[PDB]
Amino acid sequence: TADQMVSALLDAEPPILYSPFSEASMMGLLTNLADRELVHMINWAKRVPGFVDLTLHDQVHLLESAWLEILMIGLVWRSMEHPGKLLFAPNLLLDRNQGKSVEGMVEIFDMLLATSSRFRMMNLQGEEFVCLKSIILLNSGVYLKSLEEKDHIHRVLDKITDTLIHLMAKAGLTLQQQHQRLAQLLLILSHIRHMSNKGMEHLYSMVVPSYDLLLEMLDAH
Amino acid sequence: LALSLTADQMVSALLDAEPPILYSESMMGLLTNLADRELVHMINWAKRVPGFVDLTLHDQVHLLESAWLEILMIGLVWRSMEHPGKLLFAPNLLLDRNQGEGMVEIFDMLLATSSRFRMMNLQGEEFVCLKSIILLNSGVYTFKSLEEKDHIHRVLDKITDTLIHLMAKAGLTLQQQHQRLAQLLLILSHIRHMSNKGMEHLYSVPSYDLLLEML
Ligand SMILES: O=C(c1ccccc1)N1[C@H](c2ccc(OCCN3CCCCC3)cc2)c2ccc(O)cc2CC12CC2
Numbered sequence: 001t002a003d004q005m006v007s008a009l010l011d012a013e014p015p016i017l018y019s020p021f022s023e024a025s026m027m028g029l030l031t032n033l034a035d036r037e038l039v040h041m042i043n044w045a046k047r048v049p050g051f052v053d054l055t056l057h058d059q060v061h062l063l064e065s066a067w068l069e070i071l072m073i074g075l076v077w078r079s080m081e082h083p084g085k086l087l088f089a090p091n092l093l094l095d096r097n098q099g100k101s102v103e104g105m106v107e108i109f110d111m112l113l114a115t116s117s118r119f120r121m122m123n124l125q126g127e128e129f130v131c132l133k134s135i136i137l138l139n140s141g142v143y144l145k146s147l148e149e150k151d152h153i154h155r156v157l158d159k160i161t162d163t164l165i166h167l168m169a170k171a172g173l174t175l176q177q178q179h180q181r182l183a184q185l186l187l188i189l190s191h192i193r194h195m196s197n198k199g200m201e202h203l204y205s206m207v208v209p210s211y212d213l214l215l216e217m218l219d220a221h
Numbered sequence: 222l223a224l225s226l227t228a229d230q231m232v233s234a235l236l237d238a239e240p241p242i243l244y245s246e247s248m249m250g251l252l253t254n255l256a257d258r259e260l261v262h263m264i265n266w267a268k269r270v271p272g273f274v275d276l277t278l279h280d281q282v283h284l285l286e287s288a289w290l291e292i293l294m295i296g297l298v299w300r301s302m303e304h305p306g307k308l309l310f311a312p313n314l315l316l317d318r319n320q321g322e323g324m325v326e327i328f329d330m331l332l333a334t335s336s337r338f339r340m341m342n343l344q345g346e347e348f349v350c351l352k353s354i355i356l357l358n359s360g361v362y363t364f365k366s367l368e369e370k371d372h373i374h375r376v377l378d379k380i381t382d383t384l385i386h387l388m389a390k391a392g393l394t395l396q397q398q399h400q401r402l403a404q405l406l407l408i409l410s411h412i413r414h415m416s417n418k419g420m421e422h423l424y425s426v427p428s429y430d431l432l433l434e435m436l
């Protein structure tokens with residue numbers, strides 16, 4: 001049910017990781033941190049309900065599409081209550097002037113600040129965050145076995161929608177406010193997809209976990 | 222002022238605002254020429270979206286800069302819906318996957334979005350609602366300024382109520398309503414992905430002044 005869905009997602013949540021400050025080592029610090037987050041992200045995805053029911057190959061493809069989005073929404077969430085700053089790590093808090101070093105970095109940095117500000121204006125809750133995060137993992141790459149795979153992903157996404165509505169109903173929101181907030185939340189995902197693509201372009205101008213690399217982390221013994 | 226229309230009145234204003242289907246006049250000169258001609262009718266459609274002209278001209282242009290490729294794509298996806306395996310760019314330009322460097326990637330994504338619309342039985346009054354959400358939402362995060370974004374979010378909220386009212390009219394349960402709403406808005410995230418990849422593939426853009434003058 002929605003309550004067991006929330007609890008599983010709240011319990012599957014990964015930990016917050018840590019990184020004279022040097023501007024030149026910034027991209028080094030940020031790369032090392034994201035490489036370590038990827039490991040815990042693999043563990044988190046395996047505990048999202050319905051994810052491991054999928055074949056190993058579609059699990060990789062799903063993670064291949066969403067990994068940057070997921071890193072970004074977690075960054076936006078960690079930065080939600082520090083206006084104007086991104087909290088990459090508790091010991092790595094940056095403002096937009098520190099992003100001016102790399103070319104094309106401050107544009108993505110401003111889009112992440114607008115999203116964190118948008119979460120603030122919405123007063124996003126942690127139970128809603130883990131729901132959106134899980135939706136990113138299942139929806140970003142979903143567009144005979146593949147018919148069965150896709151129908152299962154959409155059934156799980158259906159359960160998460162009902163979970164979102166249930167948290168909104170438990171919060172006392174009206175039925176009209178429930179539809180409106182759900183729409184407001186899922187519309188932010190289009191912008192997160194947008195940032196991930198701009199960030200993907202920015203990473204190639206200097207990088208992506210390979211299929212063979214993601215499969216090793218997913219395929220356990 | 223425009224936030225006073227009923228859900229039925231909102232549907233009718235969007236249905237009456239739909240642009241015409243244009244015709245094609247080297248396969249890529251025709252796609253560019255087609256897209257340039259569709260852009261003018263898109264501006265006139267955007268002006269008839271309830272609440273759009275209530276924004277300043279500066280913010281109207283910014284919304285159109287962000288959403289124009291998405292709106293052309295969802296319109297193409299809508300036209301190709303009844304044509305499996307092919308995209309209907311124009312009634313005299315019906316292309317297949319084999320007619321498509323970097324083009325078959327985007328072509329496949331459009332074909333998959335069209336097929337997703339088909340098995341969802343996307344309706345016309347639902348489609349016109351999804352197109353107005355793209356126009357208002359695609360640029361609201363990259364902008365008095367706060368009054369404008371409050372207005373955009375108010376109108377976006379009315380379309381949500383409009384979409385839910387259409388699903389309720391059709392006999393869907395409340396649970397089926399939330400699930401269909403979520404399903405449709407999750408496809409917008411993919412259209413945005415195609416527009417991004419399309420923009421990179423085109424780079425491999427209408428100016429502010431041009432959009433302003435067509436307005
Ligand atoms: O610096 C930036 C940034 C911020 C603002 C504007 C432009 C860029 N980023 C950081 C990052 C760094 C490298 C990386 O790719 C590394 C290669 N690759 C090699 C092995 C496989 C996986 C990684 C991905 C993300 C990072 C770190 C932690 C975090 O929580 C989130 C992010 C987000 C982000 C994308 C926005």
Ligand SMILES: O=C(c1ccccc1)N1[C@H](c2ccc(OCCN3CCCCC3)cc2)c2ccc(O)cc2CC12CC2
Nearest residue numbers: 252253255256257293294297310324327328419423426427
């Ligand atoms: O060909 C393609 C295509 C299709 C499949 C795979 C790859 C590419 N496209 C066509 C197009 C062409 C040029 C253009 O940009 C032209 C510059 N021009 C643009 C504004 C003003 C000045 C610059 C935009 C869109 C087009 C036409 C009509 C339509 O309904 C939809 C589309 C869709 C689309 C993006 C997918």
